[PDB]
Design a protein around this ligand. Structure first.
Ligand SMILES: *Cc1c(COP(=O)(O)O)cnc(C)c1O
Ligand SMILES: *Cc1c(COP(=O)(O)O)cnc(C)c1O
Lengths: 394, 394
């Protein structure tokens, strides 16, 4: 089938919850994607930061192909041989006692909210059901009814109420607002992204995450760090929170935890939080399955073995420096850490022409530039010239 | 590692949200599982009905191995060549206009609730935010904050509030209660399982689903059928609702939609419901990815090509008939449709001894008996004798 045929078939038989950029891909490998006409493209979205390791990374592929012949799903009604090996590996990597395995990023966020409330009631001693969770304006952590209840984007929540109670919102990047909010003794947790991704790569000021950690500790509130997009080398560190040497109470991972080969998400925290949830209190059919666990071990090993944090750091400096040379009259701002970057400009027309010139990006007047972390400098510099050609063609 | 080593390692590094039956599996194929000591077992849980096609079905495995070398995740920011082919296939199979792809069963349920509310406000004309959704006591559809808010199991919701408003509960298998509930003009939907699985294989009376359909139509309420566990040949029909020739407004599928090789879930409904959700209003990173889509096509083709509905029907009759010969003094009840069955009996001690005798089951005083649908009569009769040996050894 042709590209238009592909667009039309989805239009007929699939829900219209997305309006994708009109490009139809059939193969991907490393930093590249090819459409059905055979044209090649640089991938500068990385599937919302899930293919940090590049598309179809052979080590992760090999892990999938090995385990799929053995065993793919027991459910957690029984034990399998893989899960505990993955749990020991990942908990030691990030230095938390335990992990709770789930499948999608929003599932990890839901899990963290349950953890926070159960901890609020049974350890902090908040009365049922007065526990509150604080969120930052611009947050994105998924599309469930709980997740849209904390959103400040009307596209997410308008028309879908009534909303989950017990969720408060303050501005991002704002320590006085957090301090004022945590005067309320019924707050159990503050959940926040170290860099807000879907909001448009909003980078907070130096010292913000240090201040969050101090304030949360000072008021005995759990600091939930959502690293589903910012984590796993994307910003030039293992976790973006590492830039300020801050240790959250709960860390969320997803997306690139599998290199894009399987939906695997993780909730990391110590025993004093994790063991508030008892047997039977939190279930998921596929969470912790052995196929996804093998895939995730390999996906994490790739990030470590190939020094992708260091590459993302070095190449991100080059990327932002060159984007800053774009005319201030057309590109109003450049921002990012590592290889999570964006420019401010419409943005859709820009992305259509980037596509024409061989580079795939999507707007979120903001264009995100997030290639896989396995990109090399010469490939990055070639990509930058496509961005320049495109911006300078208007 | 030994079995005890496996138990201890998960105990140290993994959350305690499950207390699994103490058996440690490393391989599965068809109806069988093997533990790390090499012992072989009949699987009578089928991973909560996700391996209807049997473990590691070669056709589904081959689909996974083929696509993983090509392309695994673009995100829905762009098109890929696989998704629309899967969408056209599945919508025609069940005769709905469109499908909305998600990953887990609870994600499909969350999606249906958003659909119902958005439809309630914009098509039925309910005022914001007075839309209600009705659920049945005993329902299970996942572990998110919205899903536990409609539960009547205190293990699920106690300690996790405050709860999602707008959710009402009535008894299962109760047409007068549904009629009374739907006198409220702000109900947008009634969500119900055709057979309640996690509640203990609670089978409603003949005519219940016919009565639900009539009542929902009479009062312009959406009938949401949760077939994530009962669907896909498990009960001896494509959908359990087919036993009463009833067509819901929204059908949920999950679990066996992938044969256990990938978390794939589906929301099926016609354009008058589905198109209430617009671009940007409902997102999921992995939903609709091409790897899961290839896997699901193959998983569905297996159910059709191997006549597993018919096998589950015929063998389920044999299974229930033999279980009914167990002493009334020990087994108080037998129930089920197709190969979703249970007996009422503690049940944990029974399952420990079934395990000792080569058959794996889990309690939910209720023991579920749900082997893969590819089981043959001689294998089933051999399994039945293990159940007999075990029950009669007490
Ligand atoms: C996408 C995203 C989520 C939700 O992840 P899904 O896997 O799409 O459900 C949560 N948090 C952040 C920061 C995200 O970017
Ligand atoms: C398990 C289940 C769900 C939830 O599915 P997950 O994939 O575990 O989230 C929903 N509905 C029913 C009937 C189920 O059995």
């Amino acid at each position: 089938p042709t590209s238009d045929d592909i667009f039309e078939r989805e239009y007929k038989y699939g829900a219209h919850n997305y309006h994708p950029l009109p490009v139809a891909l059939e193969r991907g490998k490393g930093i590249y994607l090819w459409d059905v006409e055979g044209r090649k493209y640089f991938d500068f979205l990385s599937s919302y930061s899930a293919v940090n390791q590049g598309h179809c990374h052979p080590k992760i592929v090999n892990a999938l192909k090995s385990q799929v012949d053995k065993l793919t799903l027991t459910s957690r009604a029984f034990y399998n041989n893989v899960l505990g090996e993955y749990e020991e590996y990942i908990t030691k990597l990030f230095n938390y006692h335990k992990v709770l395995p789930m499948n999608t990023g929003v599932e990890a966020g839901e899990t963290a909210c349950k953890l926070a409330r159960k901890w609020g009631y049974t350890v902090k001693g908040i009365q049922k059901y007065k526990a509150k969770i604080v969120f930052a304006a611009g947050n994105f952590w998924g599309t469930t009814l709980s997740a849209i209840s904390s959103s400040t984007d009307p596209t997410s929540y308008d028309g879908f109420g009534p909303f989950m109670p017990g969720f408060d919102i303050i501005p991002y990047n704002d320590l006085p607002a957090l301090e004022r909010a945590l005067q309320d003794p019924n707050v159990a947790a503050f959940m926040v992204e170290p860099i807000q991704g879907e909001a448009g790569v909003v980078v907070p000021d130096p010292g913000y995450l240090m201040g969050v950690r101090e304030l949360c500790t000072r008021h005995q509130v759990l600091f939930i760090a959502d690293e589903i997009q910012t984590g796993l080398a994307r910003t030039g560190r293992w976790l973006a929170v590492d830039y300020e040497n801050v240790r959250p109470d709960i860390v969320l991972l997803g997306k690139a935890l599998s290199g894009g080969l399987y939906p695997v998400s993780a909730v990391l925290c110590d025993d004093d939080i994790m063991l508030t949830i008892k047997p039977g209190e939190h279930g998921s059919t596929y969470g912790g399955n052995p196929l996804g666990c093998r895939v995730a071990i390999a996906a994490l090993e790739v990030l470590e073995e190939e020094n992708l944090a260091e590459n993302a750091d070095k190449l991100g400096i080059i990327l932002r420096n060159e984007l800053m040379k774009l005319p201030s009259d057309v590109v109003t701002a450049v921002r990012g850490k590592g290889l999570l970057n964006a420019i401010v400009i419409d943005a859709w027309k820009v992305c259509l022409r980037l596509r024409d010139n061989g580079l795939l990006a999507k707007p979120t007047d903001i264009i995100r530039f997030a290639p896989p972390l396995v990109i090399k400098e010469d490939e990055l510099r070639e990509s930058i010239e496509i961005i320049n050609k495109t911006i300078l063609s208007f």
